[PDB]
């Protein structure tokens, strides 16, 4: 019977993210996955900027960026009648090599299709990953969990003893079901096909017209994205199952007489499900097992990676012994509302496409179809089409309102686009300490107290943390620009990079503050 602190069920992006977070917190763990880490049908390709900030923390951001996506491939989204047909609307998004690094983050989004990401993540996790292994059954005990690890090549079964079991086993989570936890549908389930294909000369023919993603505007079945996966000949076409031959569907979508090789054609379900509970005893749900949503926006894998990072520090805190008895409970308390609002935002992007009218005369050339296209273009812009491709709020703007956060007033009524804020509950904002060091590079270990222009009360804060063995680092900053951004003289940041408390003056009961933020109050 082999034993580990945490047993991770699932070796997809989410499970691997949790493994990386545990390794960087020196927590003993183990990943088991039914597969080798070779994706035959790559699904996801876009990694959001918050996820990249986390990959930067874990030291794999650089290798993700240099993994093979061409620096000169356009990142645009465009709506067209057919690929190589008439163009209706385009959002220019530059290239990797030419776009300006954004002011609010050191890590812009990245393209890394699953068949590059999987081996790259397998490499950084090392031998703690266990491939071709399935979990057949588990049993909860008082101080640990016991599970059955059956080798898929061999057929034989083994036993693992872990303090905690974390289920990252996808949208049809067998773990979730065996716990009796429901995940009701919040919107209609839809059926689509994914056609993966090679088209080696397509990029050359498109030339200036190339895009990261095309939205087709052909028929009721072909109104969905066709995306360039590796920028080197690999593409995926999304086809709706309303109630045709694979090659023929691609031919309809692409108005070039060019080489096309269909690799696979697989059906998938678009679902909107969030679990009623994210844990039961020592068993935790994360990733799709906890929450699935519409990929329209690319929020799904990023929400999972963010949840993995949240669960990660709390598990570590509990195993170290400085956590309060209620800390683990805040995982569901904080992350579940995040899944819900992300789901609903993803569904808005989806409905924009589903409700969009495809008027007659759209495909006809000349002056009349040219006018019709120009009219639709105007309606596309007014519908907020670019929000699907520029959504800082969904990536950076979630604000925790929980029992371990010393929250401020304000309601939830937006007044402008998202803007960086150091308010309690929120992601502490990026700024350049030096040209090489971000404020983000201070976070990710224990708690951090950022003080501007002073060290008053700091010795007291340190003692209060030490008396409960809670890890704390204190940093003094003298940049007025950074002080203005954070708006307060003292800012207390959590192990996950979110603010727990801020103020011009430290509280009188520093012990009460400590117990509060560790989940003991
Ligand atoms: C077509 C499509 C496109 C998408 N595009 C994007 C995108 O561009 N950006 C984005 O952010 N998100 C995207 N998503 C969402 C993304 O796919 C999911 O959020 C994510 O893949 C799920 O994370 P996960 O690792 O928890 O689940 P999975 O990726 O399903 O991980 C499950 C893994 O666990 C293993 N496993 C399962 N059961 C067992 C068992 N009993 N024993 C052992 N091992 C087991 C399996 O081997 C599997 O590899 C997309 C989704 C789809 C369907
Ligand atoms: O990666 C994807 N895979 C599918 C997908 C994806 C993305 C997607 C990925 C990154 C950014 C925006 C995105 N919008 C969509 C999408 N909008 C859609 C509408 C109908 C059917 C599928 C999609 C869709």
Q: What is the CA(34)–ligand 1 centre distance, in A?
A: 13
- Tell whether 49 and 142 lie within a shared domain: yes
- Tell whether 270 and 287 lie within a shared domain: no
Nearest CA to ligand 2 atom 16: 296
- Domain termination residue (choose one: 342, 368, 396): 396
Q: Cα(354)–Cα(357) distance, rounded to whole angstroms?
A: 8
Q: Cα(455)–Cα(33) distance, rounded to whole angstroms?
A: 49
Nearest CA to ligand 2 atom 23: 296
Nearest CA to ligand 2 atom 3: 295
From the CB of residue 15, how many other CB atoms can be counted at a distance below 10 Å? 28
In the numeric block, which tokens belong to residue 440? Answer: 């983000």
Q: Is the separation of the CB atoms in 287 and 168 below 8 Å?
A: yes
Q: What is the resolution of this structure in A?
A: 2.3
225-228 and 213-216 beta bridge pairing: antiparallel
Contacts of 130 (CB under 8 A, 6+ apart): 30, 31, 32, 33, 149
- Tell whether 392 and 282 lie within a shared domain: yes
- Tell whether 164 and 233 lie within a shared domain: no
Q: What is the CA(289)–ligand 1 centre distance, in A?
A: 9
Q: Cα(33)–Cα(207) distance, rounded to whole angstroms?
A: 41
- Tell whether 288 and 424 lie within a shared domain: no
Measured N-to-C along each axis, helices 13-23 and 114-125 cross at an angle, to the nearest 10 degrees, of: 30
The per-residue b/e assignment along 81-118, b for 16 or more CB within 10 angstroms, e otherwise, is bbbbbbbbbbbebeebeeeeeeeebbbbbbbbbbbbbb
Q: Is the separation of the CB atoms in 50 and 109 below 8 Å?
A: no
CATH number of the domain bearing residue 245:
3.30.9.10
Q: What is the CA(8)–ligand 1 centre distance, in A?
A: 14
Q: Cα(474)–Cα(251) distance, rounded to whole angstroms?
A: 61
Q: What residues pair up with 267 in beta bridges, in sequence order?
A: 193
- Is the beta carbon of 42 within 6 A of some atom in ligand 2? no
- Tell whether 115 and 13 lie within a shared domain: yes
Q: Cα(281)–Cα(441) distance, rounded to whole angstroms?
A: 34
- Tell whether 44 and 83 lie within a shared domain: no
- Tell whether 120 and 176 lie within a shared domain: yes
Across 34-83, the runs of DSSP E, i.e. the strands, are 46-47, 77-80
In the numeric block, which tokens belong to residue 358? Answer: 């495809």
- Domain termination residue (choose one: 277, 303, 324): 277
Q: Which domain holds residue 438?
A: 397-521
131 DSSP assignment: E
- Domain termination residue (choose one: 350, 366, 396): 396
CATH number of the domain bearing residue 44:
3.50.50.60
- Breaks after residues in the chain, judged by C–N over 2.5 Å: 243
- Is the beta carbon of 302 within 6 A of some atom in ligand 2? no
Question: What is the phi/psi pair of residue 160, to 5°?
Answer: -125, 135
130 DSSP assignment: E
Q: How many domains are contained in the chain?
A: 3
Question: What is the phi/psi pair of residue 75, to 5°?
Answer: -105, 10
Q: What is the CA(238)–ligand 2 centre distance, in A?
A: 9
- Tell whether 2 and 41 lie within a shared domain: yes
Ligand 1, CB cutoff 6 Å, lining residues: 9-15, 32-35, 43-46, 133-135, 168-170, 174, 194, 268, 287-289, 295, 298, 300-302, 304
3-class DSSP assignment, residue 490:
strand
Q: Cα(230)–Cα(298) distance, rounded to whole angstroms?
A: 17
From the CB of residue 298, how many other CB atoms can be counted at a distance below 10 Å? 23
Ligand with smallest separation from the Cα of 345: 2
Measured N-to-C along each axis, helices 49-57 and 300-320 cross at an angle, to the nearest 10 degrees, of: 30
Contacts of 287 (CB under 8 A, 6+ apart): 10, 12, 14, 15, 168, 170, 304, 307, 308
- Tell whether 427 and 307 lie within a shared domain: no
- Tell whether 154 and 198 lie within a shared domain: no
Pocket test for ligand 2, best of 225, 345, 385, 389 (most atoms within 8 A of CB): 225
Nearest CA to ligand 2 atom 2: 295
- Tell whether 252 and 149 lie within a shared domain: no
Nearest CA to ligand 2 atom 20: 224
Q: How far is CA 21 from the centre of its chain?
A: 14
CATH number of the domain bearing residue 438:
3.40.30.120
Contacts of 492 (CB under 8 A, 6+ apart): 447, 448, 449, 450, 499, 500, 501, 502, 513, 517
């Amino acid at each position: 019977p082999i034993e580990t602190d945490v047993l991770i069920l699932g070796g997809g992006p989410v499970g691997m993210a949790l493994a990386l977070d545990l390794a960087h917190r020196q927590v003993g763990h183990l990943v088991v996955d039914a597969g080798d880490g070779t994706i035959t049908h790559p699904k996801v390709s876009t990694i959001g900027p918050r996820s990249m900030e986390l990959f930067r923390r874990w030291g794999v951001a650089k290798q993700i960026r240099t993994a093979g996506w061409p620096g000169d491939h356009p990142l645009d989204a465009a709506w067209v009648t057919r690929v190589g047909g008439h163009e209706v609307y385009r959002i220019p998004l530059g290239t990797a090599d030419t776009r300006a690094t954004p002011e609010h983050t050191p890590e812009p989004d990245a393209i890394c299709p699953a068949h590059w990401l999987a081996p790259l993540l397998a490499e950084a996790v090392g031998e703690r990953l266990r491939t071709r292994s399935r979990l057949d059954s588990f049993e909860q005990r008082d101080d640990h969990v016991r599970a059955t690890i059956t080798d898929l090549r061999t057929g034989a079964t083994r036993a693992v003893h872990a303090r905690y079991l974390v289920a990252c086993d996808g949208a049809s989570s067998p773990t979730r079901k065996a716990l009796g936890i429901d995940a009701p549908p919040r919107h209609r389930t839809q059926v689509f096909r994914n056609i993966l294909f090679r088209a080696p000369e397509l990029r050359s023919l498109l030339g200036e017209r190339a895009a990261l993603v095309f939205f087709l505007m052909l028929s009721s079945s072909l109104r969905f994205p066709l995306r360039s996966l590796d920028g080197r000949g690999l593409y995926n076409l999304v086809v709706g199952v309303d109630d045709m031959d694979s090659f023929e569907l691609v031919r309809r979508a692409v108005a070039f007489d060019t080489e096309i090789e269909v690799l696979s054609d697989s059906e998938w379900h678009l679902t909107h499900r969030v679990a009623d509970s994210f844990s039961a005893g020592r068993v935790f749900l994360t990733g799709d097992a906890a929450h699935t949503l519409s990929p329209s926006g690319g929020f799904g894998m990023n929400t999972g990676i963010g949840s993995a990072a949240d669960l990660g520090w709390k598990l570590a805190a509990t195993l170290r012994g400085w956590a309060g008895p209620g800390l683990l409970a805040t995982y569901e308390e904080e992350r579940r509302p995040v899944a819900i609002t992300s789901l609903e935002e993803a569904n808005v992007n989806l409905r924009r496409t589903m409700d969009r009218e495809l008027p007659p005369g759209l495909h006809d050339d000349g002056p009349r179809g040219e006018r019709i296209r120009a009219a639709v273009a105007e309606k596309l812009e007014r519908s907020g089409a670019r929000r699907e491709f520029d959504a800082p709020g969904i990536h950076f703007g979630h604000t925790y309102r929980s029992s371990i956060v010393c929250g401020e007033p304000e309601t939830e009524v937006a007044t402008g686009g998202w803007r960086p804020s150091a308010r309690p509950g929120a992601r502490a904002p990026h700024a350049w300490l030096t040209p090489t060091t971000s404020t983000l590079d201070l976070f990710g270990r224990g708690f951090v107290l950022l003080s501007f222009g002073t060290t008053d009360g700091v010795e007291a804060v340190t003692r209060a943390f030490a008396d409960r063995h809670v890890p704390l680092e204190t940093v003094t900053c003298h940049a007025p620009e950074i002080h203005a951004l954070y708006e307060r003289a003292h800012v207390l940041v959590r192990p996950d990079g979110h603010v727990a408390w801020r103020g011009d003056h430290l509280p009188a009961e520093l012990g009460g503050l400590v117990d509060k933020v560790r989940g003991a109050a």
